[PDB]
Design an enzyme around this catalytic site. Structure first.
Site, PDB file in Angstrom:
ATOM      1  N   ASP A  45      -0.478  11.503   6.485  1.00 24.17           N
ATOM      2  CA  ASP A  45      -1.133  10.584   5.314  1.00 24.17           C
ATOM      3  C   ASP A  45      -2.223   9.461   6.115  1.00 24.17           C
ATOM      4  O   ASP A  45      -2.945   8.793   5.494  1.00 24.17           O
ATOM      5  CB  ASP A  45      -0.293   9.875   4.424  1.00 24.17           C
ATOM      6  CG  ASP A  45       0.318  11.004   3.586  1.00 24.17           C
ATOM      7  OD1 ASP A  45      -0.308  12.000   3.148  1.00 24.17           O
ATOM      8  OD2 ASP A  45       1.665  10.760   3.023  1.00 24.17           O
ATOM      9  N   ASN A 115      -3.396   3.241  -0.972  1.00 23.77           N
ATOM     10  CA  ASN A 115      -2.002   3.005  -1.207  1.00 23.77           C
ATOM     11  C   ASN A 115      -1.716   1.500  -1.780  1.00 23.77           C
ATOM     12  O   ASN A 115      -1.120   1.516  -2.922  1.00 23.77           O
ATOM     13  CB  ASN A 115      -1.436   3.157   0.174  1.00 23.77           C
ATOM     14  CG  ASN A 115      -1.051   4.466   0.499  1.00 23.77           C
ATOM     15  OD1 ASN A 115      -0.984   5.310  -0.461  1.00 23.77           O
ATOM     16  ND2 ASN A 115      -0.419   4.797   1.819  1.00 23.77           N
ATOM     17  N   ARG A 141       8.027 -17.939  -3.934  1.00 21.99           N
ATOM     18  CA  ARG A 141       8.338 -18.157  -2.576  1.00 21.99           C
ATOM     19  C   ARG A 141       9.173 -16.901  -1.989  1.00 21.99           C
ATOM     20  O   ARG A 141       9.986 -16.612  -2.595  1.00 21.99           O
ATOM     21  CB  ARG A 141       9.234 -19.246  -2.709  1.00 21.99           C
ATOM     22  CG  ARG A 141       8.864 -20.521  -1.565  1.00 21.99           C
ATOM     23  CD  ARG A 141       9.005 -20.033  -0.299  1.00 21.99           C
ATOM     24  NE  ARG A 141       8.709 -21.252   0.824  1.00 21.99           N
ATOM     25  CZ  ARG A 141       9.682 -21.974   0.957  1.00 21.99           C
ATOM     26  NH1 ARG A 141      11.033 -21.977   0.682  1.00 21.99           N
ATOM     27  NH2 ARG A 141       9.583 -22.918   1.844  1.00 21.99           N
ATOM     28  N   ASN A 157       5.478   0.406  -1.536  1.00 19.19           N
ATOM     29  CA  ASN A 157       6.115   0.077  -3.071  1.00 19.19           C
ATOM     30  C   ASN A 157       7.392   0.463  -2.958  1.00 19.19           C
ATOM     31  O   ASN A 157       8.360  -0.201  -3.543  1.00 19.19           O
ATOM     32  CB  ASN A 157       5.226   0.356  -3.967  1.00 19.19           C
ATOM     33  CG  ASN A 157       6.000   0.366  -5.436  1.00 19.19           C
ATOM     34  OD1 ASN A 157       5.820  -0.662  -6.066  1.00 19.19           O
ATOM     35  ND2 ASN A 157       6.324   1.380  -5.687  1.00 19.19           N
TER      36      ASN A 157
END
Ligand SMILES: Nc1ncnc2c1ncn2[C@@H]1O[C@H](COCC#Cc2nc3c(N)ncnc3n2Cc2ccccc2)[C@@H](O)[C@H]1O
Ligand SMILES: Nc1ncnc2c1ncn2[C@@H]1O[C@H](COCC#Cc2nc3c(N)ncnc3n2Cc2ccccc2)[C@@H](O)[C@H]1O
Ligand SMILES: Nc1ncnc2c1ncn2[C@@H]1O[C@H](COCC#Cc2nc3c(N)ncnc3n2Cc2ccccc2)[C@@H](O)[C@H]1O
Ligand SMILES: Nc1ncnc2c1ncn2[C@@H]1O[C@H](COCC#Cc2nc3c(N)ncnc3n2Cc2ccccc2)[C@@H](O)[C@H]1O
Lengths: 257, 257, 257, 257
Positions: A45, A115, A141, A157
């Site tokens: 990939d 991506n 934060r 992710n």
């Protein structure tokens, strides 16, 4: 028609590339790495990612194909033993398209991500105000944020707790990186999935220097005024010669093959 | 036009209901809880949920409105002090629609969910084979599974680590409940977001009795052969009199108000 | 006895510091920032962290006290309005001790951490073999790892999903940062809690340069052969003048105050 | 000395049991399932769990041994092919001890757990006030809570995001089950690790009926006034004939074997 082949660079990929070029020589096919209509990536990939960004200015005119010389990839989903059949079928397929993520960095530069795109601090504390369609949603934060494309949800992710989205859904997903949550600082915690035409804007609070990543590339940006995220109007196009469902790709990569 | 009002049942909601009925008496409005065109819910999201399932057979002919007598709800997003203005504006608005989840239980019964539908065991171990569009994706071992609508993602789905989806996205989200993961048992772990026309099927392995929930309702189902999940073709319709964005609703409910 | 006071540097902390020094002048107390027996920190946990590392070579001979000029800290758990009472009681208390984390970096340098020590890559991919008491446990791929002290578990460790440990337990906790998990790469995922005398060793696979943090300090280390983690034999000592339970500190900082 | 053997009940375990009994007949060994000094479990961790609770009133006088006829268990960590060697070595070993969890249910009944004890509602909403050493820590809203022993942390505790604790640490770990967190309801979220002599008390808010589990057993308790959790003074004793480290057991069960 015009085509080109990028390679991982190892002995396995280069010789698979030379064999397909030789196979293409037996057909009406012209090698051209300037204006190809077919871009073939041989490697992982990461190689496909590089092939994508190499031709990100001609996405509407290119059908991508990925071949994995090592393990199964989500974009390189063709086994090397199928290259000859791939050459044959490509000589005479349909196209499927995946959504992309547009990143705008104002100080203005725009980037396309297959991506994801992430934001981290330049060393100190990472603090940004998160603005969704011009309304202030939260002051984040933590270590950083990650905005993922649908097909990107199986990558960075996923490691951050985000959901896996089917690439037919035109959306982007924002996930947090080690957010601080106490009585004074508060984030949503959950991943956020945004549809087309929603704009997510990150805005500095004190430090204005951010390390911004887009797929494999990562650049330190200085004097940032805003980072804007939105589902791109451009799409990447794949040449499909058979049915390899996305959920089957997920199963083969994560459950077992 | 025809309307009706359901109430939480407390003193606050009943008298707000009686005042709006009196206010509606000053306009061309007919109270009718058999074939209303406007269903007003006064209470919390639980009251709105009950109002939804009370009229789930006339969804294409009803515009829902929610009023929260207590804290802010995601469906009851009108303050009680706005009821008089609500009566006025309703006398003479547009409609927005949210996707729904269709649950089919074969032994065949079908249910509609505004928030989510969950599956748990009848007491023993919960083991199901998860089948996505007729391909076997995983064998789930754990406490259960939860399939959420977009607007339902802020509810049970959120507590299980699922992502928050904007209700404009026609999709459903599957999240795991305390899945076992070791060398022998393997689940995907991440939440899964499915588009329209994808069918997720749960199929028994040993035990055939399951406790199936749909929104607030929870029934023990016996001799189950299959549970089928898919984005419903029906949609719920809201009467909108002003802009209250979903992400603002999320911010007001979870960040601060 | 000998004492010293470090300050956040703002107007509020400096003048609170000058008032306590003046108050100490009315007692048999000698200011000495070379060999103090009492180290008072005025500011936040960051100021206390700096006070700790300033005197980390005389831990067996110092009782620390923290005063928070802003919000409640886990180490600075005295309100500014109690400084006069603090001066009085300190003039004539017991000691409680918290465990510390020893970090050894071989190429050899050793560091002490009050909160945690983290390891990340120098830019490229972070890959380390995790070795527990000389047995190979896992090959970690991800953003990094974090080894936390008990009192440190409420800080970076908490944001990474780690458990909160009561500081009476002599232990260290290892948590993952965005670990990759698929068919080929596999980590434990769960946080790991190690007792005294267990040694956790991180060992490179390809890249030998790591960005290693210890509390607030973060240094790029080059040509690393091994990073060794273990519960330190040294302990930090607090002067306690009343009961402020750790779980109450957790409740006040995270639930509400 | 006196011994007994419990079996999973399948053909594999019963005949392994009969062979060891025959092997024990060649030594000075007396079968006795009333007052055994050695309890051998043949099956999985579920069989070992049953063997533990069968003799939970003579824990100070029993050394347990587990044999796994199927996959590796955390308590049944002996391969069946080692039974003859096990019989031999047992004829002429040291003891290691793991902490246990004491559960007190007042209306008073006390239970001992080797893995964990969980609390869920009897059907409606689960709401309990969590009290730590008589100070109110939080009001929990969600599916339930789970208090785990150290060796139990690899079981239900792990699936809920809890940390894995080495069994040498005398502690208990509390983890949440699908806790609700919004502007009004607030839990700590992180797992909590408590040392010896800390008492965690769950107290009802509205509903007083709870489904309480202890290891495999699960009983509906009615009119509960309080559930008290604390590290037990009793310990379970294992007969160890060689080194099988806990972290190696974790690696073999979760990483690969
Ligand atoms: N902690 C992290 N966890 C996960 N990925 C991370 C992390 N850190 C950085 N990256 C990533 O590096 C990428 C650039 O290199 C090329 C690529 C790719 C890829 N794309 C996918 C995909 N879509 N689906 C499944 N596998 C994929 N890989 C393979 C892969 C898995 C894990 C790590 C790296 C690569 C960039 O796409 C970041 O996502
Ligand atoms: N552990 C759990 N966490 C979260 N929700 C859970 C859990 N267990 C069961 N439920 C739920 O009970 C529901 C039936 O009652 C009426 C309703 C509703 C509702 N809908 C939403 C929403 N869409 N957005 C935000 N707030 C909502 N609430 C309010 C609410 C928050 C938390 C608990 C219960 C209710 C059913 O919709 C399940 O989702
Ligand atoms: N993502 C992150 N989440 C949480 N902390 C992070 C993160 N990134 C880096 N740090 C940290 O910076 C620290 C160095 O500065 C001084 C300090 C301290 C401190 N100590 C604690 C504590 N023991 N309990 C509760 N509050 C604490 N704070 C306050 C605090 C909360 C959140 C961020 C920063 C500071 C170092 O101790 C890292 O832990
Ligand atoms: N969702 C869940 N995830 C994990 N465990 C769950 C869940 N639900 C209920 N249980 C459990 O059933 C148990 C009673 O039966 C016997 C046993 C045991 C056991 N003990 C351990 C252990 N110490 N280490 C690793 N493997 C173990 N198993 C094997 C095992 C793994 C997963 C599920 C069931 C059993 C009770 O000990 C609950 O923990």
């Amino acid at each position: 028609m015009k085509y080109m082949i990028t390679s991982k660079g190892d002995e396995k990929s280069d010789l698979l590339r030379l064999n397909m070029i030789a196979g293409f020589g037996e057909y009406d096919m012209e090698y051209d790495d300037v204006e190809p209509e077919i871009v073939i990536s041989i490697g992982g990939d990461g190689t496909f990612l590089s092939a994508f960004h190499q031709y990100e200015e001609r996405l509407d005119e290119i059908a991508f194909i990925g071949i994995h010389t090592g393990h199964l990839g989500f974009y390189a989903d063709w086994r090397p033993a199928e290259a000859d059949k791939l050459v044959k079928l490509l000589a005479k397929y349909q196209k499927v398209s995946y959504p992309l993520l547009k990143t705008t960095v104002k100080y203005e530069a725009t980037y396309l991500a297959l991506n994801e795109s992430t934001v981290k601090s330049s060393g100190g504390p990472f603090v940004v105000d998160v603005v969704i369609n011009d309304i202030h949603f939260e002051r984040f934060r933590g270590d950083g944020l990650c905005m993922s494309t649908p097909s990107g949800t199986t990558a960075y992710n996923k490691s951050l707790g985000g959901a896996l989205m089917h690439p037919s859904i035109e959306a982007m997903q924002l996930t947090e990186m080690a957010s601080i949550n106490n009585r004074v600082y508060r984030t949503i915690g959950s991943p956020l999935v945004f549809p087309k035409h929603h704009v997510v804007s990150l805005q500095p609070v004190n430090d204005k220097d951010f390390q911004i990543s887009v797929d494999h590339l990562s650049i330190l940006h200085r004097d940032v005024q805003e980072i804007r995220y939105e589902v791109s109007a451009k799409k990447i196009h794949f040449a499909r010669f058979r049915s390899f469902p996305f959920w089957r790709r997920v199963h083969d990569s994560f459950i077992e093959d």
